[PDB]
Write a protein that binds this ligand. Sequence first.
Ligand code: B6J
Ligand code: CL
Length: 263
Amino acid sequence: ALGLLRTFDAGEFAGWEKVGSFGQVYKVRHVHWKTWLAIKCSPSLHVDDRERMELLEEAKKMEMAKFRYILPVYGICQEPVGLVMEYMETGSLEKLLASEPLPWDLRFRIVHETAVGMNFLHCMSPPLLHLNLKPANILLDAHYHVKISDFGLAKCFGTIAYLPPERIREKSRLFDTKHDVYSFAIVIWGVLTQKKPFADEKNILHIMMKVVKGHRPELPPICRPRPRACASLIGLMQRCWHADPQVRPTFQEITSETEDLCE
Ligand SMILES: Nc1nc(N)c2nc(-c3cccc(O)c3)c(-c3cccc(O)c3)nc2n1
Ligand SMILES: [Cl-]
């Protein structure tokens, strides 16, 4: 896994441009390869042996999940300590949802492509859990196709919204596939609304308390352009955010339904 990865000297890169932030992300130009890449440097000034090894586990987990809808990783840079990744021109879904009103055919495809990627992770032996899925992680290429990113919290802030209610109920609960299914439901909410969940609210703790009983983000209305598929996606979202995690569908089932929304 970590053998096909490379080590990058900072001399190999050029024209650094900040893009995200967590740790800052930079669009760099590999000079000898004549192509662009992304690199994520650590926030700290000193990088201890936990960081260096943690970054390596993130890279290994990315290479293991080589797939169409997963972000490719090339190696780890040493000069500044950071992860050398594929550059996605269109950037994050978060930025795209803020940017402008999106057509529904796209929205449904972004949802489906994300779902296919997540399904792939869960299909591994053993399953790879993402445990961090949010529109900031969901990255889009020049032609608006998804690649899932940020395996920093994977397993073999304003982010309370993506946290499952069972995680608030029980201190130190065992992580599962149904964690990702919940977060994915909140992503769907983001696509249907182009809003951030609980954006306007007074306080975190009140909403996090109400979530443990049943209070989820307010349902969007049925859209005019694609009212049949919208209603269907909304349905799926609701099943994906159920309080009882055994009621939530598997990504095998989810992909099966999101595919029909693209037909
Ligand atoms: N254009 C572009 N290209 C990228 N390759 C890119 N990569 C990331 C990223 C960050 C950490 C880990 C990781 O596996 C990917 C982010 C990123 C993800 C989450 C939060 C954040 O601040 C930045 N944004 C990006 N944007
Ligand atoms: Cl429709």
